[PDB]
């Protein structure tokens, strides 16, 4: 069962900082599905644009925790999608 968040909701919440080359009036057209996997630490994240899956990434919460240890606040969850590490870890653990 995917948990779905629009880019706009994640932007409002502070999880998402920006999407390169997307006007903020297009954030409503971007949706992220976050899907559990057979590993408790690993999440399958799909990036959709107007209902179409454009890319996907597997995120291991331990890789995020390692970032929280270089004192890194933000990452690029997709080459264009900047996200806040601490808020993402909280989201994935919720």
Written account of the structure:
With 94 residues, the protein is α+β, with helices and mostly antiparallel strands. The protein is 26% helix and 44% strand. It has one domain. It has 3 helices and 7 strands. The strands form 2 sheets. It has a 4-stranded antiparallel beta sheet with strand order 1-3-4-5. Strand 4 and strand 5 form a beta hairpin. The longest helix is centred in the last third of the chain and has 9 residues, at 61-69. Binds to activated CDC42 and RAC1 but does not seem to stimulate their GTPase activity. Associates with calmodulin. This is Ras GTPase-activating-like protein IQGAP2. It comes from Homo sapiens (Human).
Number of domains: 1
Report how far apart the termini are. Answer: 14 Å
Q: Return the string of H and E elements.
A: EHEEEEHEEH
Number of continuous helical runs: 3
Strand content: 35-45%
The main sheet comes to: 4 strands, antiparallel
Biggest sheet: strands side by side, in what order? 1-3-4-5
Q: Share of helix among residues? A: 25-40%
Structural class: alpha+beta
Give the radius of gyration. 13 Å
Give the overall shape.
globular
| E-strand count | 7
Protein name: Ras GTPase-activating-like protein IQGAP2
Function: Binds to activated CDC42 and RAC1 but does not seem to stimulate their GTPase activity. Associates with calmodulin.
PDB class: signaling protein
Keywords: gap, structural genomics consortium, sgc, Calmodulin-binding, Signaling Protein
């Amino acid at each position: 069962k995917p948990v779905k968040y629009t880019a706009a909701k994640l932007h409002e919440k502070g999880v998402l900082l920006d999407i390169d080359d997307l006007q903020t009036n297009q954030f409503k057209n971007v949706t992220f599905d976050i899907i559990a996997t057979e590993d408790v630490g690993i999440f399958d994240v799909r990036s959709k644009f107007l209902g179409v899956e454009m890319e996907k990434v597997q995120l291991n919460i331990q890789d995020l925790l390692q970032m929280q240890y270089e004192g890194v606040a933000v990452m690029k969850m997709f080459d264009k999608v900047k996200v806040n590490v601490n808020l993402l870890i909280y989201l994935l653990n919720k």
